[PDB]
């Protein structure tokens, strides 16, 4: 959570002279991050979902929410109301605890790293990336898993334009290409 | 032969055909064929009349057909007693009111079109007259 | 939206009270100040109003944004209403969950004579 302290001094001043904001409240703040972990194959086995939820509980610092089917899909054979995904919304200190724990610990452990994409912005200053292997988080001791647990990390900020969300992460030296 | 692609209901009430038409003024082409007599144009009559004028101009210009059938006229089988269900749909007519612009043309001279609509009118049942697009 | 969400929450309670011809005790909670005004059954004219913006209340407090501040406010609305002779009244949460500051205001009014 020391990166939050980084924000309060380093980031804000580096940003007010970068886009020329007339107010300190107009610079972007990182709202929240959502660690979604789509399991999908939970219909094949219920404890497949339990193994999935346990690993996601390790990644974050809290118990995730078992999301279900919004609508019934026959393409993937799921009725209206079947648990198929697991998400958790880090907000506040633990959000910062996680944000820093990703950029200084996790990404360096990504096999064949070459930098992230600056095109992963939806268009509202909100960044959304996707890790393939969850193994880059030291929580999993490697010798307890059996599935390639992939999870998406989507950051929502208060930025009004996607390019403003970009330079926000440039303040934290968020690795790209 | 125009026919509604997948209509809402299969059969329909007979109804009456009253009042003056709506498409009175010519709005697409330069010349038109406005109806004067009341009546109903079946799909086969609109189809036949179109060929009559498409040959008159050889193939050229634009021929707008501002009227569409969209009204299934049913019919019983030959020699059957009355009642026991409504008839089966046979053809599709289009109720025409006086002052209705049936066709519209453009690109050809007035003499050619007044001659083209002459052929067209000989195929239609309702007494039709020639009209032109005026400003406003 | 925080505001309008709260307002459509208040409508049900308000429509029911404005059709029973009941005098209502409404309360608007804000981060810094609490409002309490009593409205007649016709709906346009109020009878008794008392909030933390009034000097006669604001002066004797420490900060106008806590339970005890409202506890004094609830006390005042029952005292001013009784010089008007208003004993039976009805309560409106006005979109606020009856839990903290609003709850403090209410019981202070109940123990002050205003029976609602």
């Amino acid at each position: 959570a020391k990166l939050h302290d980084y924000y309060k001094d380093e980031v804000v001043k580096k940003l007010m002279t970068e886009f020329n904001y007339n107010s300190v409240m107009q610079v972007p703040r990182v709202e929240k991050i959502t660690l979604n972990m789509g399991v999908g194959e939970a219909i094949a086995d219920k404890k497949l979902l339990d193994n999935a939820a346990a690993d996601l509980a390790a990644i974050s610092g809290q118990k995730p929410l078992i999301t279900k089917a919004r609508k019934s899909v026959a393409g993937f054979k799921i009725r209206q109301g079947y648990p198929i995904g697991c998400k958790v919304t880090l907000r506040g200190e633990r959000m910062w605890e996680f944000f820093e724990r990703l950029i200084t610990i996790a990404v360096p452990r990504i096999r064949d790293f070459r930098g992230l994409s600056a095109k992963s912005f939806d268009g509202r200053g909100n960044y959304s990336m996707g890790v393939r292997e969850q193994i880059i988080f030291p929580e999993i001791d490697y010798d307890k898993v059996d599935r390639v647990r992939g999870l998406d990390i989507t950051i929502t900020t208060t930025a009004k334009s996607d390019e403003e969300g970009r330079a926000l992460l440039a303040a934290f030296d968020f690795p790209f290409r | 032969m125009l026919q509604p692609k997948r209509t809402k209901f299969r059969k329909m009430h007979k109804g009456r055909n009253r009042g003056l038409a709506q498409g009175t003024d010519v709005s697409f082409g330069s010349f038109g064929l406005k109806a004067v007599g009341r009546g109903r144009l079946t799909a086969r009559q609109i189809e036949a009349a179109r060929r009559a004028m498409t040959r008159a101009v050889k193939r050229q210009g634009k021929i707008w057909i501002r009227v569409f059938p969209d009204k299934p006229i049913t019919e019983k089988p030959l020699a059957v007693r009355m009642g026991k269900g409504k008839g089966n749909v046979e053809y599709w007519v289009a109720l025409i009111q006086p002052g209705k612009v049936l066709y519209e043309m453009d690109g050809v001279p007035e003499e050619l079109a007044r001659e083209a609509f002459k052929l067209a009118a000989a195929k239609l049942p309702i007494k039709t007259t020639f009209v032109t697009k005026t400003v406003m | 939206d925080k505001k309008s969400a709260r307002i459509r929450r208040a409508t049900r309670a308000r429509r029911k009270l404005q059709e029973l011809g009941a005098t209502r005790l409404v309360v608007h909670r804000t981060p810094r100040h609490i409002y309490a005004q009593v409205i007649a059954p016709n709906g346009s004219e109020v009878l008794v109003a008392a909030s933390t913006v009034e000097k006669a209340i604001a002066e004797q407090l420490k900060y106008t944004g806590n339970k005890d501040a409202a506890a004094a406010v609830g006390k005042a609305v029952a005292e001013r209403a009784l010089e008007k002779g208003i004993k039976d009244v009805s309560f409106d949460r006005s979109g606020f969950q009856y839990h903290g500051r609003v709850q403090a205001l209410a019981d202070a009014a109940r123990e002050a004579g205003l029976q609602f």
Binding site: A1, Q62, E100, R101, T104, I105, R109, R114, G115, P138 | - | -
Partner: protein
């Protein structure tokens, strides 16, 4: 943060090939001995030492030798 459902939070310690005295909170309940961090990044200069293709003339000149 309702209790009894979320795992523990201890201030864990992390090391690096750079000798990073890194103390971050996590739910491990161990002591992590890591190789790479943001201070011993193989990326920042790894880009220029990644692409070196687009040359065969000097490569070919080692065979002509003159």
């Amino acid at each position: 943060m309702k209790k009894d459902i979320h795992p523990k939070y201890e201030e864990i310690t992390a090391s690096c090939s750079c000798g990073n005295v890194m103390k971050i909170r996590s739910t491990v309940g161990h002591d992590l001995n890591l190789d790479v961090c943001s201070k011993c990044h193989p990326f920042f200069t790894g880009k220029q030492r990644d692409v070196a293709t687009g040359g065969r003339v000097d490569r070919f000149n080692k065979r002509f030798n003159i």
